[PDB]
Design an enzyme around this catalytic site. Structure first.
Site, short mmCIF file in Angstrom:
data_model
loop_
_atom_site.label_atom_id
_atom_site.label_comp_id
_atom_site.label_asym_id
_atom_site.label_seq_id
_atom_site.Cartn_x
_atom_site.Cartn_y
_atom_site.Cartn_z
N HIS A 10 0.84 -1.21 0.00
CA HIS A 10 0.00 0.00 0.00
C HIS A 10 0.87 1.26 0.00
O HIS A 10 1.97 1.29 0.62
CB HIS A 10 -0.92 0.01 1.21
N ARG A 61 -6.34 0.95 2.99
CA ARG A 61 -5.09 1.50 2.50
C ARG A 61 -4.59 0.63 1.31
O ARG A 61 -4.00 1.19 0.36
CB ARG A 61 -4.05 1.66 3.61
N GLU A 88 -2.50 -6.98 6.99
CA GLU A 88 -1.34 -6.67 7.85
C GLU A 88 -1.37 -7.55 9.08
O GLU A 88 -2.41 -8.01 9.55
CB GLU A 88 -1.39 -5.19 8.25
N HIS A 183 0.32 -5.56 2.28
CA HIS A 183 0.87 -4.92 3.47
C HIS A 183 2.29 -5.37 3.75
O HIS A 183 2.74 -6.41 3.26
CB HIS A 183 -0.01 -5.23 4.70
N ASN A 185 3.85 -6.85 6.44
CA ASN A 185 4.14 -8.18 6.95
C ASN A 185 3.49 -9.29 6.14
O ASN A 185 4.04 -10.39 6.11
CB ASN A 185 3.58 -8.42 8.37
#
Ligand code: CL
Lengths: 247, 247
Positions: A10, A61, A88, A183, A185
Site C-alpha cells: 500500500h 489502504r 497486515e 501490506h 508483513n
C-alpha cells in the site's frame, strides 16, 4: 514461457506518516500515499505491465492503492478478490499507539521486538476491547480461532502461505497475470517463502510503500528472479529501517 | 422478512454532460457525477443501508460510482462482481456522436427511435471499426455472437434478465443484501421485468443518474414496492425526458 507476478505494498498511510502502530486498524492513505499509488500505476503502464486478476486485503489502504493502480492502467474492470488472509499483521493492544511514545514508556529494544521479532507477539487484546476484530462486519464469517488478539510474522505466514498455495498460485498456473496489493508483513511473509529466507534474513527486509516488486517464475513455477521497478536510489533509500522515533 | 435490493444508475458521465451517445464507450464520470456518486453513498448511510455484495458493469462510469458509494458506506472491502452483462445498451455507429448534431442531420424523430424504440437498433458497426468491442481486452472471453455491433433495449433485456435469474437473484435468496451500480438501459431492462411493464410503459421511464432506487421483495421474492431515496422534487424533475438538443 516465464510468468510474471507483481507485488505492491500500500501507498503511505496516514498512520505511517503519524508514526502509529496500525495492524488491522482500517486507516486510509495519506495524501502522499495516494500520490505513491498513482505513480506505481503509471510506472507499471510505462513498463508494459497489465493484468488478468487482482488480489488485495480487506483494509482500505491496500484496496485504495489497488483502485488507483487499476485506474492508471485503464483496468478498473479487472476482477478483484479481497481477503482478510492478506491483512497486515495484527498489532494487539499496540494498535493506535505512537511508536516513539511507546518506545519511551517500555524501552526501544522492547518496541523493536514487538515490531519485528519473528515469533514475538505484541501484547494481546481482550474480546471486549473496542478494537477486537469480532465486532467488525467484515469478519462476520471468521471463527474465534481466526479472529486475532495479536499476531507475529510467524502467525502471519501461517495464514498467507496457505492462501498462496490454495488460491493465488493456482490462478497464476492457469496462465493469468496476477497483481497483489497488500501490506508490509503479509508481503514479507510471501517473500520469505518465495526467496527461501531464514528468520535472520527476513528480519532485515523492508518492502517500501508503493514500489512494484516483480517476480519471474519458470515453467515449473520456481522463482527465477525478483526486482523493483522505479528509481533505484530512491527505492534503496526507502527500504532502510526507520528508528522508533521516526525519520 | 422483506428483502431489500438497491439499484443505482452511474453518476453523470462526461458524455452525458456533453450530449454524446456513449453505449459501450468507456467514458468517465464528470465532476458533477463524482459529486452525485458520493451523495448517493452518504444518503444510503443516513437511511440505514449497508450491503453484503455488489454487482456492476465493466464500464468505469458505473464502477467508479460504486467505489465512491462503498467509500461513503465504509464498505470498500465488499465483494464486487463486474460483468459485461450489465453494460449499457450498445449504440452502434452512433457512439461518440453529438445527439443534437445527429438529430439535425438525420431528423429528430429518427434520433428518438434510435434512442428509445423498443426493438429498434442503432446503425451497426463493422468488425474493423476501431470501436468494435472485439478489439478490447476486457471482452477477450466473448464470442462473435456475444460481441455487439449494435443493441436495442429488447437485446439488452435478453442479456440482463438471464444474469438476474442465474446469478443475482439466487444470491439475494441466500440472504445477502445486494447493490447493483449500472446503466440507463440495463436498469430499465431489469425494472421492466420486475414491474411487469409493457413496451409503452418502459419507453416512458427514465432512471436519473445517481439516485438510489430501492426494491422490497416478499418471502416468495415477488416485488412488493419500489421507491427512490432523496429529495422528491429534485428526483422527479430529473426523471423527465430531455430533448435531443439537450437541457
Ligand atoms: Cl473492485
Amino acid at each position: 514461457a516465464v510468468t510474471k507476478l507483481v507485488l505492491v505494498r500500500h501507498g503511505e498511510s496516514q498512520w505511517n506518516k503519524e508514526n502509529r502502530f496500525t495492524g488491522w486498524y482500517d486507516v486510509d492513505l495519506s495524501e502522499k500515499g495516494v500520490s505513491e499509488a498513482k505513480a506505481a500505476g503509471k510506472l507499471l503502464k510505462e513498463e508494459g505491465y497489465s493484468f488478468d486478476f487482482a488480489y488485495t486485503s480487506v483494509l482500505k489502504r491496500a484496496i485504495h492503492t489497488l483502485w488507483n493502480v487499476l485506474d492508471e492502467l485503464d483496468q478498473a474492470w479487472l476482477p478483484v478478490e479481497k481477503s482478510w488472509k492478506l491483512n497486515e499483521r495484527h498489532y494487539g493492544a499496540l494498535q493506535g499507539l505512537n511508536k516513539a511514545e511507546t518506545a519511551e514508556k517500555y524501552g526501544d529494544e522492547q518496541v523493536k521486538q514487538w515490531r519485528r521479532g519473528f515469533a514475538v507477539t505484541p501484547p494481546e487484546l481482550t474480546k471486549d476491547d473496542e478494537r477486537y476484530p469480532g465486532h467488525d462486519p467484515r469478519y462476520a464469517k471468521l471463527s474465534e480461532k481466526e479472529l486475532p488478539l495479536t499476531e507475529s510474522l510467524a502467525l502471519t505466514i501461517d495464514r498467507v502461505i496457505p492462501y498462496w498455495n490454495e488460491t493465488i498460485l493456482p490462478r497464476m498456473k492457469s496462465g493469468e497475470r496476477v497483481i497483489i496489493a497488500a501490506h508490509g508483513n503479509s508481503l514479507r511473509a510471501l517473500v520469505k517463502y518465495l526467496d527461501n529466507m531464514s528468520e535472520e534474513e527476513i528480519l532485515e527486509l523492508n518492502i517500501p510503500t508503493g514500489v512494484p516488486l516483480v517476480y519471474e517464475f519458470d515453467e515449473n513455477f520456481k522463482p527465477l528472479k525478483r526486482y523493483y521497478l522505479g528509481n533505484a536510489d530512491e527505492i534503496a533509500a526507502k527500504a532502510a529501517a526507520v528508528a522508533n522515533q521516526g525519520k
